[PDB]
Amino acid sequence: SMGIVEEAHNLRVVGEGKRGVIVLAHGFGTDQSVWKHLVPHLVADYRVVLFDTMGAGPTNPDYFDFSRYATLEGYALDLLAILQELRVASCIYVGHSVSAVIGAIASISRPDLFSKLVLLSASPRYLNDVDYYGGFEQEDLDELFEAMGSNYKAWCSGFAPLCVGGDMESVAVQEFSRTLFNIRPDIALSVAQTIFQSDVRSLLPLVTVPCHIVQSTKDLAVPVVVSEYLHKHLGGDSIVEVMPSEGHLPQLSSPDIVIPVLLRHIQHDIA
């Protein structure tokens, strides 16, 4: 229907609402299905754009250009190309995990395209640094990459429960383990490296669009102080809400708690 963007990113547009356009962008290891519980709440007031990030399970690996995605800039360029194709004057953008940062980077280039950013499970840097707590030391990354490269399937089964949190036998843990294992293992290792070694802290002052910073109180990959870091270093107005949820994909695993929070941040503007 919409062409290369639709074929390459499985782009879907639903809803017939007139308050505006909402773009939903998923994190590493999942796909647009991560939004399944949010979309029904948005279609009455909004037009909702869903897409899969290049290299996600449902995408064709033949379109994955390793040089393009060597930095997160390539993902931000993909997002700008989607927004331009869509002929959006502006949108509410909800970015999960790495897509939070991808949106923020895109918004530096084209602040006109974004009325606000909702940053769910966001971090500007996973590695600790001097006076900065991201939750990870380089040794932890080396152990992670070693598992990923030794037996990716076993890694997926062992990682899913830690990342999703809550009960191990839950539908959500099984679902994420499956979407993780849909990533071709060479793409998975490459992208994980790119993400886990990225550091966009010095870019945050350039972000001028209002940002709503939403995360789980207990999230393996995002210590709560990271929300505070974002709040103190973004270049525009921001607000933080730490949810009484566990896990890095809480819109999938605890929607009864999380969907109301996301809807409030979508609907209510900060001064």
Author numbering: 0 to 270
How is this structure described in the published paper?
KAI2 receptors, classified as plant α/β hydrolase enzymes, are capable of perceiving smoke-derived butenolide signals and endogenous yet unidentified KAI2-ligands (KLs). The KAI2-mediated signaling pathway shows homology to another phytohormone signaling pathway, strigolactone (SL), where key proteins involved in KAR signaling (KAI2, D3/MAX2, and SMAX1/2) share sequence and structural similarities with proteins in the SL signaling pathway. The SL signaling pathway comprises a homologous receptor to KAI2, D14 (DWARF14), the D3/MAX2 E3 ligase, and a homologous substrate SMAX1-LIKE 6, 7, and 8 (SMXL) in Arabidopsis or D53 (DWARF53) in rice. When focusing on the binding pocket, several residues including the Ser-His-Asp catalytic triad are conserved in all proteins, highlighting its importance in the catalytic mode of action performed by α/β hydrolases.
Rice, a significant crop and representative of grasses, relies on KAI2-mediated Arbuscular mycorrhiza (AM) symbioses to flourish in traditionally arid and nutrient-poor environments. This study presents the first crystal structure of an active rice (Oryza sativa, Os) KAI2 hydrolase receptor. As observed in previously determined KAI2 crystal structures, OsKAI2 comprises of a canonical α/β-hydrolase fold with the binding pocket situated within the central core domain, beneath the helical lid domain (residues Tyr125-Ser197). Upon a closer inspection of the binding pocket, the conserved Ser-His-Asp catalytic triad is positioned at the base of the active site. The pocket comprises a hydrophobic cleft made up of phenylalanine, isoleucine, and valine residues, making it well-suited to bind the aromatic rings of KAR or KL-type ligands. The OsKAI2 pocket was compared against that of AtKAI2 (48) which shows similar pocket residues, with the exceptions of C162 and A191 in OsKAI2, which represent smaller side-chain groups in the positions of A161 and G191 in AtKAI2. The OsKAI2 pocket analyses revealed a pocket measured to have a volume of 108 Å. This is an intermediate pocket size when compared to others in the family, such as AtKAI2 with an approximate volume of 63 Å, OsD14 at 149 Å, and ShHTL7 (51) at 215 Å. Strikingly, due to its distinct proximity to the ligand binding pocket, residue C162 was selected for further inspection. Interestingly, grass KAI2s contain a cysteine at this site, resulting in a receptor that is sensitive to both (−)-GR24 and dYLG ligands. Therefore, the C162 found in grasses may be important for selectively sensing grass-related KLs or grass-related KL AM signals in the soil.
